[PDB]
Design a binder for these strands. Structure first.
Ligand SMILES: [Mn+2]
Ligand SMILES: [Mn+2]
Length: 546
DNA sequence: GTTGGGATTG
DNA sequence: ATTCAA
DNA sequence: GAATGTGTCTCAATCCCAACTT
C-alpha cells in the first residue's frame, strides 16, 4: 500500500548482494564476483529493470509488459544489460514459449493458413501445432510484422545460486523483504554471528543445486534409470545435505511402488535413512513376494527401532511374515480398551463438519469446548520454550527471515540447547510457568514460529487451558514432542473440553461415519491412557427422521 | 458483459 | 484424509 | 488389513486474458 521510495525492490536486492559479499566471500567464483561488480557499474534504471525481471515468473518478457514509471523507458534501460550478455534480444524460441508470449488472437492470425479445424482452447492448438513446427526460430522467423521486441534473461541460474546462498534454501523469494516491511510476515529477530552462514563449503551449494535439479527433472517425467546414475551412490559428509538426498531417494521409491516395480523400490528404500523408510522396504519385499528377506529385515528392525512409529507397524508386519514362512502364530493382548463414547446426532444440514457438530453438542453451560487438534499443546510448548528455540546457537540463524532454527529437525537439537531446555521446562516445577507464558504470549504475538498457532490461541482458550491443565501432564507432553519432533506433532485429538469450575479437562477425538483412528493418533492415545490422562474417542452416527 | 485463474504489486 | 478386500 | 488422491512453506487488492453468456 505504497512504501515511500519507489525503488524499494532494488534497494533490497543491493542489500542481498553486499551480504553475500561479506559472508560468502571465501565461497565465490570468478563468474560470481564478476556479476556483483558488473551490477554495481550499471546505472540505476538498468539495475532496477534487471531486478524486475529477476523477480517475475517468466524468463521471457515482451517489452510492453515491462512498464514501470521509476524506470521510465524500457529500451533505454535494457541496453547496458544487452551489452553485458545478461539479456538477449532475438532469443531462439520453442513453439511452446512463443505461445507463452503472444495472445490467442495474434496466434490464430499468424497460423491462419495451417489451421482451419475450429477455434478451440489455446493449449489444444499448441498440441495440434507442435507436430508441424518442430524447430525453434528467432521471433522474426515466426512473424516479422510483430511490433514488440522480446527479451530473455540469461543469468537466472547465477541469481538462483545467490538466493540459495542467502536463504539457505530455494523456496523463499525476494518478496520476503517487502512482505516483512509491510508487517505481513513478522519474524523474530535474533542476534546471530557476524559470519554466520547457511553453507560452509562451496561444493555443498554445488550439491544442493544438483539435488534440486534431480527433483525437478523427476517431476517432469524423466525415467529413473538415468536419474539414479546422476545421483551419488555414496552418502554426503554434510548432515543436513544428506537429509535432502535421502528424502529424494525415498520419493523415487514411492513412485516405484505405484508402478508396481517392487524390487527396485526395496533397493531404493534400503539405501535411505529417512524416517519410516526401512518399514516401507519390508513392506515392499512382502509385496514383491519375498518373505524370507522381508522377515529377515523385520527381525533386524525390531532389535533397535528407529522410532515409535516403526514399532507400531512392525507389530503388524512381523506376525504376517511369520505366518507366510510357516512359523507358528504367537500370543498377544488386544489393543488396550479404546475409551469409547457414542453419539447419535441430528443430520446437520447443510454440513457443518462433524467436529463442529460434536463441539456444539458437548458445549453446555458450565463447559467450554474448543476445536484445536494439537494446536493447543504445540502452542503452549512453543511459548514456554521460545528462548530455547530462538537461542542464537552457532549456525542456527543467518538472515532476518527465519521462522525456525535451521537445526530443528536435527537429532542433536535437544543436546545443543539442553542448558536452556532444562531452564525452560524447569519453570513447570515452580509456579512461574503460568506468568512466563502469559508474558511470552503478549510480547511474541504474531511472530512466525514453528510451534505457536496464534489464530487458534485466543485469550479465553489460553486462560482456561492455563488454569485447567496440570503441569505434570505438560511435562509429560513437552518431553514426548521434544523426543521426535516431526513424528510427534501430529496425532492429538480434535477437541478439548474444559470444566473451568473444577479445573479439569478431557480431550476428545471425533471420528465420523466410516472414519477410523490413524496411526499417530493411536500412539497418542496409548501414551495418554498410560499416564491416566483424560482422553476419549467419540464415534458419531447420524439420525435422519424417516 | 461476466467468471475464474494466474501473475504481479507493495 | 479418503477408498478396496472379506 | 492394505492401498492412493499431496510438496508445508496459509498476505489481499489488481490487472490481464482466456473461457464462457445471448
Ligand atoms: Mn481431525
Ligand atoms: Mn478426527
Amino acid at each position: 500500500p505504497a512504501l515511500p521510495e519507489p525503488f524499494y525492490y532494488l534497494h533490497n536486492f543491493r542489500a542481498v548482494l553486499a551480504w553475500i559479499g561479506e559472508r560468502y566471500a571465501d565461497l565465490l567464483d570468478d563468474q560470481e564476483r564478476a556479476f556483483i561488480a558488473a551490477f554495481a557499474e550499471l546505472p540505476e534504471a538498468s539495475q532496477a529493470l534487471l531486478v524486475r525481471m529477476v523477480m517475475r515468473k517468466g524468463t521471457l518478457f515482451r517489452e510492453g509488459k515491462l512498464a514501470y514509471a521509476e524506470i521510465g523507458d524500457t529500451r533505454a534501460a535494457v541496453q547496458p544489460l544487452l551489452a553485458l550478455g545478461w539479456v538477449d534480444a532475438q532469443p531462439t524460441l520453442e513453439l511452446a514459449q512463443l505461445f507463452g508470449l503472444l495472445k490467442k488472437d495474434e496466434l490464430s492470425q499468424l497460423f491462419r493458413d495451417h489451421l482451419g479445424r475450429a477455434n478451440l482452447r489455446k493449449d489444444a492448438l499448441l498440441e495440434r501445432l507442435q507436430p508441424l513446427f518442430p524447430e525453434a526460430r528467432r521471433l522474426a522467423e515466426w512473424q516479422a510484422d510483430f511490433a514488440e521486441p522480446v527479451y530473455e534473461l540469461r543469468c537466472m541460474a547465477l541469481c538462483d545460486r545467490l538466493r540459495l546462498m542467502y536463504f539457505g534454501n530455494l523456496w523463499q523469494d525476494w518478496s520476503e523483504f517487502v512482505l516483512a516491511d509491510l508487517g505481513i510476515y513478522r519474524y523474530e529477530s535474533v542476534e546471530f554471528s557476524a559470519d554466520s552462514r547457511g553453507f560452509r563449503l562451496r561444493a555443498d551449494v554445488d550439491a544442493y543445486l544438483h539435488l534440486f535439479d534431480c527433483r525437478q527433472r523427476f517431476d517432469l517425467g524423466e525415467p529413473l534409470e538415468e536419474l539414479l546414475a546422476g545421483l551419488p551412490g555414496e552418502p554426503y559428509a554434510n548432515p543436513w545435505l544428506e537429509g535432502r538426498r535421502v528424502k529424494l531417494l525415498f520419493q523415487f521409491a514411492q513412485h516405484c511402488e505405484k508402478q508396481r516395480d517392487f524390487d527396485l523400490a526395496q533397493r531404493l528404500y534400503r539405501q535411505s535413512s529417512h524416517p519410516g523408510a526401512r518399514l516401507r522396504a519390508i513392506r515392499s519385499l512382502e509385496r514383491g513376494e519375498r518373505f524370507a528377506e522381508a522377515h529377515a529385515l523385520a527381525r533386524e528392525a525390531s532389535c533397535a527401532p528407529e522410532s515409535d512409529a516403526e514399532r507400531q507397524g512392525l507389530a503388524r508386519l512381523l506376525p504376517r511374515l511369520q505366518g507366510k514362512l510357516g512359523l507358528p502364530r504367537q500370543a498377544r493382548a488386544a489393543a488396550p480398551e479404546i475409551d469409547r463414547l457414542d453419539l447419535c446426532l441430528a443430520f446437520p444440514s447443510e454440513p457443518c463438519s462433524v467436529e463442529w457438530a460434536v463441539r456444539e453438542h458437548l458445549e453446555e453451560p458450565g463447559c467450554a469446548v474448543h476445536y484445536v487438534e494439537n494446536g493447543l499443546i504445540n502452542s503452549l510448548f512453543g511459548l514456554l520454550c521460545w528462548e530455547a528455540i530462538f537461542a542464537a546457537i552457532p549456525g542456527a540463524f543467518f538472515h532476518p527471515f527465519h521462522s525456525a532454527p535451521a537445526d530443528l529437525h536435527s537429532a542433536d537439537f535437544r543436546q545443543r540447547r539442553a542448558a536452556l531446555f532444562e531452564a525452560c521446562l524447569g519453570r513447570l516445577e515452580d509456579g512461574s510457568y503460568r506468568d512466563a507464558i502469559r508474558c511470552r504470549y503478549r510480547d511474541k504475538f504474531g511472530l512466525q514460529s514453528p510451534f505457536v498457532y496464534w489464530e487458534l490461541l485466543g485469550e479465553e482458550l489460553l486462560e482456561q487451558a492455563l488454569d485447567c491443565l496440570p503441569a505434570a501432564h505438560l511435562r509429560a507432553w513437552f518431553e514426548r514432542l521434544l523426543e521426535d519432533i516431526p513424528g510427534n506433532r501430529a496425532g492429538l485429538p480434535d477437541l478439548i473440553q474444559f470444566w473451568p469450575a473444577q479445573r479439569r479437562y478431557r480431550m476428545v477425538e471425533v471420528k465420523g461415519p466410516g472414519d477410523r483412528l490413524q496411526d499417530n493418533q493411536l500412539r497418542w492415545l496409548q501414551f495418554c491412557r498410560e499416564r491416566e490422562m483424560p482422553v476419549a474417542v467419540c464415534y458419531v452416527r447420524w439420525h435422519v427422521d424417516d
